[PDB]
A paper describes a structure:
Here, we combine structural, cellular, and evolutionary analyses to demonstrate that SepF is the FtsZ anchor in the human-associated archaeon Methanobrevibacter smithii. M. smithii SepF binds to membranes and to FtsZ, inducing filament bundling. High-resolution crystal structures of archaeal SepF alone and in complex with the FtsZ C-terminal domain (FtsZCTD) reveal that SepF forms a dimer with a homodimerization interface driving a binding mode that is different from that previously reported in bacteria.
We determined the crystal structure of MsSepFcore, at 1.4 Å resolution. The protein is a dimer in solution, with each protomer consisting of a 5-stranded β-sheet flanked by 2 α-helices. In addition, a helical turn insertion (η1), between strand β2 and helix α2, is conserved in archaeal sequences but is absent in bacterial homologs. Despite their quite similar monomeric structure, the dimeric arrangement of archaeal SepF differs from that observed for the functional dimer in CgSepF, where the dimer interface is formed by a 4 α-helical bundle. Interestingly, the functional dimer (as defined by its complex with FtsZ) strikingly differs between MsSepF, where it is formed via a β-β interface, and CgSepF, where it is formed via an α-α interface. Importantly, a bacterial-like α-α interface is not possible in archaeal SepF because a crucial glycine residue (Gly114 in CgSepF) buried at the center of the bacterial interface is substituted by charged residues with longer side chains (Lys, Glu, Asp) in archaeal sequences, precluding such interaction to occur. However, the only other available bacterial SepF structure (CgSepF) revealed that a C-terminal helix α3 interacts with the β-sheet of SepF and would therefore preclude formation of a β-β interface. Remarkably, helix α3 is predicted to be conserved in most bacterial sequences including B. subtilis, but not in Archaea. In fact, we (and others) did not obtain conclusive experimental evidence that MsSepF polymerizes, and the three available archaeal SepF structures provide no hints about a possible mechanism.
Author numbering:
A (entry chain A), B (entry chain A): 65 to 149
Amino acid sequence: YEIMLIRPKTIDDINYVVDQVLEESNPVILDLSFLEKESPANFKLAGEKIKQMRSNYGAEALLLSRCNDKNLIIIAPKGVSLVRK
Amino acid sequence: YEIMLIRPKTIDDINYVVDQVLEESNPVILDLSFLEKESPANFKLAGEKIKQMRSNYGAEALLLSRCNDKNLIIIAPKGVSLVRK
């Protein structure tokens, strides 16, 4: 399919991430660093939406790296399993 | 399908990464930090195998984050497109 890479800057960008995972069943490599730096409130909202996707839609969300101006998480929809070796 | 997460420590682990992308058509989120620190030669070999997968098998390989003890690259097989918004 497609794996989407997104660095959201607005609440609408967050809702686009949600739609990609839930409606399109595309994994998203999400960079939360802009929200974390510039809008604590929208950073918190993004975390709440990730919580909702995990709890209510069966998505996985795995921290990859939070370092040097990036805060990278992979969100995988139900049907694309993360497998760590 | 499956997205594999692997931090190789040996040449055999590298060849397993290759097999996942080429034979199983699974994307791999690859952490090269152990090779980079502990074996420059095997780090270089991993780079050569990534080059071969891109050039000869149509794979994509996109740097995600090299920071604070991680060197993360996503390798996507032909048929799983990376899409950046």
